[PDB]
Design a protein around this ligand. Structure first.
Ligand SMILES: C[C@H](C(=O)SCCNC(=O)CCNC(=O)[C@H](O)C(C)(C)COP(=O)(O)OP(=O)(O)OC[C@H]1O[C@@H](n2cnc3c(N)ncnc32)[C@H](O)[C@@H]1OP(=O)(O)O)c1ccc(-c2ccccc2)c(F)c1
Ligand SMILES: C[C@H](C(=O)SCCNC(=O)CCNC(=O)[C@H](O)C(C)(C)COP(=O)(O)OP(=O)(O)OC[C@H]1O[C@@H](n2cnc3c(N)ncnc32)[C@H](O)[C@@H]1OP(=O)(O)O)c1ccc(-c2ccccc2)c(F)c1
Lengths: 359, 359
């Protein structure tokens, strides 16, 4: 098995969202990932490409057979991932304390939104709920309209799975000294807060307000936003640095002497109007050619369906093909122990065959 | 120094956005982090709380002495972080190959947007550009309107710093059974593509389209979006599961029989108008009360300035007071080797002291 996480052994109690995203990445980078699903689901070879780099096993954890078999895998493994409400693994008998008695080396990785304790710890929820509570959602969208969710990028993955991964991998580094595993409490409401630490920093020094659509990076600056082109398609402008902004103006055919200053906020209405008219006068692909190889920080806003035809995407193999759809190649990349193409989801396996192979 | 990464040694070449964020989290979790800035920059004590859990040192890396000193740090350290355009560290004489001469154990962590090679590798950019190229930005915002940047959470941090971190720590694990460092190439256009893997999975199986504002999680579903309340503040609804959905309807006072099906997409506009009217009839805090302890997946949308007054936030100490105002405490959390409250930015110490301190 290729990649820097070769040899690493992982048990994943099937959940949804962050939990599997974490497990995917571990798999992506070489880990040996065993996913225990309930039998009352699972029905053929799985259609979710998120379950790549996986051995799947069926096992009723309610039965005593299930519990014990599960408990054998955990013994022989480096990491457990579960993303159920607090108390669930306990009441199954797969809790931390039960695991620490068949394997004090275990990294016990707990993926929630709200955390292991406190008032909301038992409430159901999704990405949008966790980011609603910590100020993040309120900051996303245009100022005249209600917040718009940034898909489930910021809560599930960015501030969820990714911190689960860091916690796991930081705990493995710790286990090189002490010789003992530990419990990783990854909560989306907390990870996503660290994810947005920049804004908390800027907020402190007067450089970010709570007004949506009126900051440097939320779309309120005319030089950090998208623009509609002649064809109804869009470009992105991120020309924050004055040298890049100048390069942009020259490409647009606008003379700096006719525009307000870039950072005179009181005149952002005029500036935006000027730039809006400029970008609207030609189509996206025009602006794409004009600015390629430029530091003007203008790029086409591609739809998923067009990503596969973008040269820079093609040449770095950011994507690969797999069953009438492209999928991202693993990330990040490693010089010596490179990852492989992910293996597609693998038809179920007996939990016995695995306990054998593991020896 | 408290945390799972106690006595991990990290050298950070000063940049902006992802590189500093990754360095922060390493700090956050105990690591020994020395940030080499350029002498022209530092005035007093840097007011960016992202520069917490660091020692700051100056050094003209273009002088002969500045270089020599920096290579002496790197020789002693475990990880180097640089976030410059490709070729830049090579020309300073801090390239991977130069660093491998003085320390074949070093984890060499390169944080870019576009990657190390390819047609856009020398192009300036920011978050909004990296996510324009790979389908992500196109997918965010309302349908009748131009795409909206999700601040810089998805390229810089979610798809950026966090993948640098996963790569640094995965490579430390690999070192444990090889004796050798290696180069981690973390490109925001890659990380952010993996971060959004779920959408790519979903489009493969016909469950996501490239139309903005028309999907389960982009704000087009009436049970996954925000709603304006009577006082002009907002709630978030995330009631995907039919049971959570049904719970929400009952708390709204809405009879399931009068409404269109939850997932009849042709009738979503009609469903949203009924839900809109219901949520508009009371204020945000009213709904927060009504749905507490509920599985209805309905939460207040708090602005940054209100987050310190939220019970669930206060009681789990997700934030700590400092300086101007609040900041996020470390994530994720660890049972045995717990992180400590971040130390503010450490006024410029001199590089020789650090070398004494490290042997
Ligand atoms: C965008 C969106 C996301 O944001 S995903 C993130 C959602 N939040 C979390 O993940 C945080 C923590 N977890 C939870 O809050 C709960 O997990 C749920 C999901 C709320 C409720 O689930 P629940 O149905 O109440 O389940 P519980 O966790 O409370 O308990 C589970 C029950 O199952 C039993 N058992 C587990 N394994 C077995 C087994 N092998 N055999 C037998 N029983 C088993 C437990 O014992 C327990 O039973 P009980 O307590 O009743 O006794 C999102 C993202 C992606 C998708 C998606 C997309 C495409 C395809 C599929 C999914 C999505 F739909 C939503
Ligand atoms: C939302 C937004 C973000 O997305 S942050 C992410 C921006 N993207 C990246 O990070 C991708 C990789 N990097 C680059 O693409 C380039 O780094 C830039 C940034 C385009 C600048 O181009 P540049 O100014 O040309 O710099 P280069 O990388 O080309 O080279 C730097 C030169 O400096 C020299 N030297 C470095 N260290 C030293 C030293 N110690 N002593 C002497 N010289 C040094 C190098 O030698 C090199 O020299 P050269 O080869 O040119 O002669 C974002 C987020 C946050 C902020 C923000 C917010 C508040 C306050 C401040 C910033 C923001 F503005 C934007």
């Amino acid at each position: 098995m290729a990649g820097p996480l070769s040899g690493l052994r992982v048990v994943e109690l099937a959940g949804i969202g962050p939990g599997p995203h974490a497990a995917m990445i571990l798999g992506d980078l070489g880990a040996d990932v065993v996913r225990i699903d309930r039998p009352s689901s699972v029905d053929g070879i799985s259609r979710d490409a998120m379950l790549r780099n996986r051995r799947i096993v069926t096992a009723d954890l309610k039965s005593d057979q299930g519990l014990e078999l599960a408990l054998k895998l955990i013994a022989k493994a480096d990491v457990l991932i579960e993303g159920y409400r607090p108390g669930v693994t306990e009441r199954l008998g797969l809790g931390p304390e039960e695991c620490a008695k068949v394997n004090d080396r275990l990294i016990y990785a707990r993926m929630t939104g709200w955390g292991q304790t406190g008032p909301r710890s038992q409430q159901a929820g999704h990405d949008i709920n966790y980011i609603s509570l910590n100020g993040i959602l309120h900051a996303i969208g245009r100022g005249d309209e209600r917040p718009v969710p940034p898909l489930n990028l910021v809560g599930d993955f960015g501030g969820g799975s990714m911190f689960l991964l860091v916690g796991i991998l930081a705990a493995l580094w710790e286990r090189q000294s002490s010789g003992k595993g530990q419990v990783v409490d990854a909560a989306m409401v907390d990870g996503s807060s660290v994810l947005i630490q920049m804004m908390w920093a800027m907020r402190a020094t007067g450089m970010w307000t709570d007004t949506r659509g009126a900051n440097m990076l939320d779309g309120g600056a005319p030089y950090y936003d998208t623009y509609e082109c002649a064809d109804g398609r869009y470009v992105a402008v991120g020309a924050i640095e004055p040298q890049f902004y100048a390069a942009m103006l020259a490409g647009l055919g606008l003379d700096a002497a006719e525009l307000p200053p870039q950072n005179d906020r009181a005149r952002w209405p005029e500036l935006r109007a000027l730039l809006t008219e400029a970008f609207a006068s030609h189509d996206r692909d025009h602006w794409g050619a004009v600015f390629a190889n430029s530091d003007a920080c203008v790029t086409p806003v591609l739809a998923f369906g067009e990503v596969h035809n973008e040269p820079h995407i093609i040449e770095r193999n950011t994507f690969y093909e797999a069953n009438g759809g492209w999928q991202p190649m693993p990330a990040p990349r490693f010089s010596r122990t490179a990852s492989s193409q992910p293996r597609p989801p693998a038809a179920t396996i007996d939990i016995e065959a695995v306990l054998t192979d593991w020896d």
